[PDB]
Amino acid sequence: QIQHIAIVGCVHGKYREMYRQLSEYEKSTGKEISFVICTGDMQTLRYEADLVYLKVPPKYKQMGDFHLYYEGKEKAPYLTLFIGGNHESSNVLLHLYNGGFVCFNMYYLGVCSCININGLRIVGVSGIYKSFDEKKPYTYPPSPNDVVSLFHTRNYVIQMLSNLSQSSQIDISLSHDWPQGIVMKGNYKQLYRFQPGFKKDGASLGSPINKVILNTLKPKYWISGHMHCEYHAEEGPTHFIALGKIGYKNAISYLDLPLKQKTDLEYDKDWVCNLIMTWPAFSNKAQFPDLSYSISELLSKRTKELDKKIIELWEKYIGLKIIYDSDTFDIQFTSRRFYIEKIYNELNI
Ligand SMILES: [Fe+2]
Ligand SMILES: [O-]
Ligand SMILES: [Zn+2]
């Protein structure tokens, strides 16, 4: 059978319109949406105070729709998985850097992670690339002086994700800005006619971090947004798809993929092991990661016996299924790190 997955570019706080168009797809076609995938710019502002962390020009300092769903006045009709972009309540996403539900049916994948759903493995890479911030650590708790840098993709996510395709393939990978160089792998002459400003950047357009991750993992699909235009390219065996912003018709597309199994949203096994084995580099809650450690060196200590022990302890303390937690985000930050520390220390290394 077939599972219909909705892929969305930039939301920019227009959730009610997005879910309205998603419902018009289900009724005008008769097909059922399994779940929704968004490439970023979610602007998950809980209340007015969160506007400080929204890095936008003054004209875009707006609350958007998310607070209606956070308050429960609105309910997301589909399970929505998303990454962070450059227009975010960056304090919220920092609290949930290990992933988490921002409200019912809206799951943030964290700074980066892999999840499981309907037999698929989905990798997310949050943020946009700025070379001067790719080596900065994260400062916690969030400070209003970090609004300009919290949403910049850090280089270390490359080492966190590089081994994820060893056991099985990655079906879908998500980034906000494009993988660098992918613009030349499609009909770029046509793209330059509708987007003349893109031609001056040439092949250096996208993110070099997402370029490396794409070449390493080679997923079936790589989805991106940010650029407010539609685009499609082929990099070896990877189908690249770019989407626009909500409000225009190039914002939503649909992947019709085979459905072997219908399963609830679950943590990815290989990601959980990476998450536990890199705990020493994240043990300082005020500044992480501590790059005096080598993430590849920490991950080289993975064995099949330790991986099995890690999953046994993860299922005990957290559970394999990703379930909704309505605790405040600062509590979910401390809770998830508490159990990562507990599982690691029980391995005795
Ligand atoms: Fe963006
Ligand atoms: O954007
Ligand atoms: Zn955008």
Short mmCIF file of C-alpha atoms and ligand atoms in Angstrom, two decimals:
data_model
loop_
_atom_site.label_atom_id
_atom_site.label_comp_id
_atom_site.label_asym_id
_atom_site.label_seq_id
_atom_site.Cartn_x
_atom_site.Cartn_y
_atom_site.Cartn_z
CA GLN A 1 0.00 0.00 0.00
CA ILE A 2 0.89 3.69 -0.28
CA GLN A 3 1.51 6.28 2.43
CA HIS A 4 1.02 9.91 1.41
CA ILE A 5 3.49 12.20 3.19
CA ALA A 6 3.10 15.97 3.00
CA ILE A 7 6.36 17.93 2.70
CA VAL A 8 6.24 21.65 3.53
CA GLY A 9 8.82 24.37 2.98
CA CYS A 10 8.70 27.49 5.15
CA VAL A 11 5.73 27.98 7.49
CA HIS A 12 6.62 31.40 8.96
CA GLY A 13 3.92 31.10 11.61
CA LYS A 14 1.00 30.41 9.21
CA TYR A 15 -0.15 27.13 10.70
CA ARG A 16 -3.90 27.60 10.17
CA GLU A 17 -3.42 28.24 6.45
CA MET A 18 -1.02 25.29 6.14
CA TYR A 19 -3.44 22.86 7.79
CA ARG A 20 -6.24 24.37 5.69
CA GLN A 21 -4.41 23.54 2.45
CA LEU A 22 -3.51 20.08 3.79
CA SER A 23 -7.21 19.41 4.40
CA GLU A 24 -8.06 20.65 0.89
CA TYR A 25 -5.63 18.04 -0.45
CA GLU A 26 -7.33 15.21 1.45
CA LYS A 27 -10.80 16.24 0.29
CA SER A 28 -10.02 17.24 -3.31
CA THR A 29 -8.07 14.00 -3.88
CA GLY A 30 -9.57 11.51 -1.42
CA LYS A 31 -6.08 10.51 -0.27
CA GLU A 32 -5.15 10.34 3.41
CA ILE A 33 -2.10 12.15 4.79
CA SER A 34 0.03 9.86 6.96
CA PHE A 35 2.04 12.72 8.48
CA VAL A 36 3.49 16.15 7.68
CA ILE A 37 7.14 17.14 7.25
CA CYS A 38 8.26 20.79 7.52
CA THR A 39 11.71 22.13 6.62
CA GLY A 40 11.74 24.98 9.14
CA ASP A 41 10.87 28.59 9.96
CA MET A 42 8.24 27.38 12.41
CA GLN A 43 8.28 30.44 14.72
CA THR A 44 7.06 28.44 17.73
CA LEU A 45 6.46 31.51 19.89
CA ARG A 46 4.55 30.51 23.03
CA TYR A 47 3.74 34.06 24.16
CA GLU A 48 4.76 37.69 23.63
CA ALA A 49 7.98 37.35 25.65
CA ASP A 50 9.37 34.88 23.08
CA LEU A 51 9.50 37.63 20.42
CA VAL A 52 12.96 38.58 21.75
CA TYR A 53 14.40 35.36 20.29
CA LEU A 54 12.87 35.82 16.81
CA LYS A 55 15.72 37.02 14.56
CA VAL A 56 13.79 38.88 11.85
CA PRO A 57 13.68 42.34 10.33
CA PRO A 58 11.29 44.58 12.30
CA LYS A 59 8.46 44.08 9.78
CA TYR A 60 8.32 40.36 10.69
CA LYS A 61 8.29 40.70 14.51
CA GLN A 62 4.93 38.93 14.69
CA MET A 63 3.54 36.18 16.90
CA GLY A 64 2.02 34.11 14.11
CA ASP A 65 -0.36 31.22 14.71
CA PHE A 66 1.65 28.84 16.92
CA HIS A 67 0.45 30.25 20.24
CA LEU A 68 -3.10 29.18 19.34
CA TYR A 69 -1.89 25.58 19.12
CA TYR A 70 0.28 25.95 22.23
CA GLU A 71 -2.76 27.25 24.15
CA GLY A 72 -4.96 24.45 22.82
CA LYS A 73 -7.40 26.78 21.06
CA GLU A 74 -6.27 25.07 17.83
CA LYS A 75 -5.35 21.41 17.34
CA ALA A 76 -2.97 20.19 14.65
CA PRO A 77 -4.95 17.58 12.64
CA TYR A 78 -1.81 15.74 11.46
CA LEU A 79 1.40 14.59 13.10
CA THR A 80 3.93 17.24 12.10
CA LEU A 81 7.70 16.65 12.19
CA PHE A 82 9.92 19.66 11.67
CA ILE A 83 13.41 21.09 11.99
CA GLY A 84 14.50 24.61 12.83
CA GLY A 85 15.18 27.33 10.29
CA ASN A 86 16.42 30.91 10.69
CA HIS A 87 13.08 32.39 11.83
CA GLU A 88 12.44 30.57 15.11
CA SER A 89 11.76 31.06 18.79
CA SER A 90 15.37 29.98 19.21
CA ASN A 91 15.09 29.76 23.00
CA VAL A 92 12.34 27.13 22.67
CA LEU A 93 14.37 25.04 20.22
CA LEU A 94 17.47 25.28 22.42
CA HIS A 95 15.52 23.83 25.37
CA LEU A 96 14.48 21.03 22.98
CA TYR A 97 17.89 20.55 21.33
CA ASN A 98 17.47 16.80 21.93
CA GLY A 99 14.06 16.97 20.25
CA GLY A 100 10.60 17.23 21.71
CA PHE A 101 6.97 18.09 21.16
CA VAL A 102 6.35 21.84 21.15
CA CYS A 103 2.61 21.05 21.34
CA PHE A 104 0.23 18.26 20.38
CA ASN A 105 1.11 16.64 17.02
CA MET A 106 4.13 18.94 16.45
CA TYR A 107 7.48 17.21 17.08
CA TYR A 108 10.79 19.07 16.79
CA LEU A 109 13.71 16.86 15.76
CA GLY A 110 16.26 18.89 17.72
CA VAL A 111 19.54 20.32 16.50
CA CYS A 112 19.79 17.04 14.54
CA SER A 113 18.53 13.49 14.96
CA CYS A 114 17.06 10.47 13.21
CA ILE A 115 13.54 9.18 13.90
CA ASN A 116 11.46 6.20 12.79
CA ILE A 117 7.92 6.24 11.42
CA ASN A 118 6.00 3.83 9.16
CA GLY A 119 9.15 1.85 8.48
CA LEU A 120 11.05 4.97 7.39
CA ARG A 121 14.18 6.57 8.80
CA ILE A 122 14.12 10.38 8.69
CA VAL A 123 17.13 12.59 9.43
CA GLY A 124 16.79 16.27 10.30
CA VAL A 125 19.45 18.99 10.24
CA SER A 126 18.33 22.32 11.73
CA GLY A 127 19.57 25.84 11.09
CA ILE A 128 21.29 27.71 8.29
CA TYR A 129 25.01 27.93 7.61
CA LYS A 130 27.23 30.82 8.68
CA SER A 131 30.95 30.05 8.61
CA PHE A 132 31.78 32.29 11.58
CA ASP A 133 29.44 30.37 13.93
CA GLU A 134 29.94 26.75 12.81
CA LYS A 135 32.44 26.08 15.63
CA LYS A 136 30.63 27.91 18.44
CA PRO A 137 29.17 25.89 21.31
CA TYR A 138 25.64 26.34 22.59
CA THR A 139 25.19 28.54 25.66
CA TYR A 140 22.53 27.50 28.18
CA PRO A 141 20.19 28.84 29.46
CA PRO A 142 19.28 30.89 26.37
CA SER A 143 20.27 34.56 26.47
CA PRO A 144 18.74 37.37 24.38
CA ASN A 145 22.27 38.17 23.19
CA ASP A 146 22.33 34.81 21.36
CA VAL A 147 19.34 35.54 19.09
CA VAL A 148 21.70 36.24 16.18
CA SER A 149 23.65 32.96 16.51
CA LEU A 150 21.36 30.29 18.00
CA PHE A 151 19.98 29.23 14.59
CA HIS A 152 23.36 28.75 12.87
CA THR A 153 24.19 25.15 11.98
CA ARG A 154 27.17 23.86 13.95
CA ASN A 155 29.83 21.76 12.23
CA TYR A 156 29.68 18.96 14.81
CA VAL A 157 26.35 17.65 13.49
CA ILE A 158 28.38 16.12 10.63
CA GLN A 159 30.17 13.80 13.05
CA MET A 160 26.93 13.04 14.93
CA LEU A 161 25.12 11.83 11.79
CA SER A 162 27.88 10.31 9.65
CA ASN A 163 27.42 6.68 10.78
CA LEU A 164 23.61 6.58 10.57
CA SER A 165 23.53 4.78 7.19
CA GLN A 166 25.84 1.91 8.20
CA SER A 167 23.13 -0.56 9.23
CA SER A 168 20.32 0.59 6.92
CA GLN A 169 19.62 3.40 4.49
CA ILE A 170 18.11 6.82 5.21
CA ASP A 171 14.79 7.33 3.46
CA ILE A 172 14.31 11.09 3.96
CA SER A 173 16.73 13.79 5.11
CA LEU A 174 15.69 17.33 6.06
CA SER A 175 17.60 20.61 6.05
CA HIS A 176 16.48 24.22 5.96
CA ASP A 177 18.94 25.77 3.53
CA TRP A 178 20.00 23.78 0.50
CA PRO A 179 23.00 21.45 0.32
CA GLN A 180 25.82 23.46 -1.23
CA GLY A 181 26.22 22.84 -4.96
CA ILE A 182 22.89 21.07 -5.45
CA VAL A 183 21.64 24.08 -7.44
CA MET A 184 23.82 23.03 -10.40
CA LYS A 185 22.39 19.49 -10.47
CA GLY A 186 19.02 20.48 -11.93
CA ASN A 187 17.56 22.94 -14.45
CA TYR A 188 19.50 25.86 -12.99
CA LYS A 189 19.11 27.96 -16.14
CA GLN A 190 15.34 27.86 -15.63
CA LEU A 191 15.78 28.57 -11.91
CA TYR A 192 17.90 31.64 -12.70
CA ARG A 193 15.07 33.01 -14.86
CA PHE A 194 12.60 32.97 -11.95
CA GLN A 195 15.29 33.67 -9.31
CA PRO A 196 17.83 35.99 -10.97
CA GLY A 197 19.54 36.77 -7.66
CA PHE A 198 20.70 33.16 -7.31
CA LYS A 199 23.10 33.18 -10.27
CA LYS A 200 25.80 35.33 -8.65
CA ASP A 201 26.42 32.73 -5.92
CA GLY A 202 26.88 29.94 -8.46
CA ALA A 203 27.65 26.51 -7.03
CA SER A 204 28.42 27.98 -3.58
CA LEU A 205 24.72 28.70 -2.95
CA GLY A 206 23.70 26.29 -0.19
CA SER A 207 25.20 24.94 3.06
CA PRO A 208 28.52 23.05 2.98
CA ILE A 209 27.44 21.16 6.12
CA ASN A 210 24.34 19.76 4.42
CA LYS A 211 26.45 19.12 1.31
CA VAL A 212 28.77 16.84 3.29
CA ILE A 213 25.91 15.08 5.09
CA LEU A 214 24.10 14.43 1.80
CA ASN A 215 27.23 12.96 0.20
CA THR A 216 27.88 10.79 3.27
CA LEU A 217 24.38 9.41 3.90
CA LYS A 218 23.03 9.51 0.31
CA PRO A 219 19.35 9.33 1.35
CA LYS A 220 16.53 8.55 -1.06
CA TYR A 221 15.23 12.10 -0.59
CA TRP A 222 16.68 15.39 0.62
CA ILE A 223 14.08 18.09 1.32
CA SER A 224 14.94 21.75 1.91
CA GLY A 225 13.24 25.14 2.05
CA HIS A 226 14.48 28.64 2.94
CA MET A 227 14.80 29.95 -0.63
CA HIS A 228 11.03 30.52 -1.16
CA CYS A 229 10.96 28.70 -4.50
CA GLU A 230 10.38 25.24 -5.95
CA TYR A 231 13.31 23.23 -7.28
CA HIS A 232 14.25 19.63 -8.02
CA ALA A 233 17.64 18.03 -8.66
CA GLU A 234 19.38 14.65 -8.67
CA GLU A 235 22.68 14.07 -6.84
CA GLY A 236 23.55 10.45 -7.57
CA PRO A 237 20.81 8.29 -6.02
CA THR A 238 19.36 11.19 -3.96
CA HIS A 239 16.23 13.05 -5.08
CA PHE A 240 16.59 16.68 -3.99
CA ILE A 241 13.38 18.68 -3.52
CA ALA A 242 13.13 22.35 -2.52
CA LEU A 243 9.89 23.99 -1.39
CA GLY A 244 8.59 27.53 -1.00
CA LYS A 245 6.86 29.39 1.82
CA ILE A 246 3.29 28.92 3.03
CA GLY A 247 0.98 31.26 1.15
CA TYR A 248 2.22 30.22 -2.31
CA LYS A 249 1.47 26.99 -4.14
CA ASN A 250 5.12 25.87 -4.33
CA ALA A 251 5.17 25.46 -0.52
CA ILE A 252 3.57 21.99 -0.23
CA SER A 253 4.31 18.82 -2.18
CA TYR A 254 3.51 15.16 -1.53
CA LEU A 255 5.61 11.99 -1.42
CA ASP A 256 3.73 8.81 -2.34
CA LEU A 257 5.88 6.12 -0.72
CA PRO A 258 5.28 2.40 -0.13
CA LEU A 259 3.84 1.54 3.29
CA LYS A 260 5.25 -1.76 4.53
CA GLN A 261 4.35 -1.14 8.18
CA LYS A 262 2.28 1.47 10.00
CA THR A 263 4.14 2.28 13.22
CA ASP A 264 3.96 5.09 15.74
CA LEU A 265 6.70 7.70 15.86
CA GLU A 266 9.79 6.12 17.43
CA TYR A 267 13.34 7.15 18.26
CA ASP A 268 15.94 5.80 15.85
CA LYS A 269 18.06 3.05 17.35
CA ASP A 270 21.39 4.12 15.86
CA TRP A 271 20.72 7.75 16.81
CA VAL A 272 20.00 6.83 20.44
CA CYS A 273 23.33 5.00 20.64
CA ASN A 274 25.15 8.01 19.19
CA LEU A 275 23.26 10.23 21.64
CA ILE A 276 24.38 8.17 24.64
CA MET A 277 27.99 7.56 23.55
CA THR A 278 28.62 11.29 22.97
CA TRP A 279 27.35 12.24 26.44
CA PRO A 280 30.84 13.17 27.78
CA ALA A 281 31.01 15.95 25.19
CA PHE A 282 27.61 17.28 26.33
CA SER A 283 27.99 16.79 30.10
CA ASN A 284 28.39 20.54 30.80
CA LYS A 285 24.84 21.91 30.73
CA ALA A 286 26.11 25.51 30.50
CA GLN A 287 28.18 25.05 27.33
CA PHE A 288 27.93 22.17 24.86
CA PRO A 289 29.34 20.44 23.01
CA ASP A 290 32.82 20.46 24.55
CA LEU A 291 34.87 20.01 21.38
CA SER A 292 38.00 19.16 23.33
CA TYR A 293 36.44 15.72 22.95
CA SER A 294 36.42 14.08 19.53
CA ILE A 295 32.88 13.07 18.58
CA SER A 296 34.13 10.51 16.06
CA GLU A 297 36.43 9.10 18.75
CA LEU A 298 33.51 8.90 21.19
CA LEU A 299 31.37 7.13 18.58
CA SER A 300 34.15 4.71 17.59
CA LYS A 301 33.59 3.01 20.96
CA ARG A 302 30.18 1.72 19.85
CA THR A 303 29.87 -2.07 19.87
CA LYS A 304 26.90 -4.31 19.17
CA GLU A 305 26.92 -5.39 22.82
CA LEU A 306 26.87 -1.80 24.09
CA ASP A 307 24.26 -0.79 21.49
CA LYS A 308 21.96 -3.55 22.74
CA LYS A 309 22.50 -2.47 26.36
CA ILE A 310 21.81 1.17 25.48
CA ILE A 311 18.48 0.37 23.82
CA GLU A 312 17.51 -1.86 26.75
CA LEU A 313 18.06 1.05 29.14
CA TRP A 314 16.50 3.62 26.79
CA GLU A 315 13.29 1.59 26.48
CA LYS A 316 13.21 1.29 30.28
CA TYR A 317 13.70 4.97 31.16
CA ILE A 318 12.33 6.77 28.09
CA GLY A 319 10.61 4.24 25.84
CA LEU A 320 11.11 3.56 22.15
CA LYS A 321 7.98 5.50 21.19
CA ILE A 322 8.15 9.30 21.09
CA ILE A 323 5.19 10.33 23.26
CA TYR A 324 3.75 13.77 23.96
CA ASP A 325 5.01 15.48 27.12
CA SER A 326 3.30 18.69 28.24
CA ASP A 327 5.96 19.68 30.79
CA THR A 328 7.63 23.05 30.32
CA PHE A 329 10.53 23.01 27.89
CA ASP A 330 13.18 23.88 30.49
CA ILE A 331 12.07 20.79 32.42
CA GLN A 332 12.19 18.59 29.31
CA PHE A 333 15.73 19.87 28.75
CA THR A 334 16.84 18.71 32.20
CA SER A 335 14.80 15.49 32.12
CA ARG A 336 16.18 14.17 28.82
CA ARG A 337 19.77 15.00 29.78
CA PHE A 338 19.23 13.32 33.16
CA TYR A 339 18.42 10.00 31.50
CA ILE A 340 21.17 10.29 28.89
CA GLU A 341 23.62 10.73 31.77
CA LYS A 342 22.05 7.81 33.63
CA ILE A 343 22.19 5.41 30.67
CA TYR A 344 25.80 6.34 29.86
CA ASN A 345 27.01 5.87 33.44
CA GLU A 346 25.32 2.46 33.61
CA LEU A 347 27.43 1.28 30.66
CA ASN A 348 30.62 1.56 32.77
CA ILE A 349 33.22 2.84 30.30
FE FE B 1 14.46 30.40 6.11
O O B 2 13.27 32.12 4.41
ZN ZN B 3 11.50 30.99 4.69
#
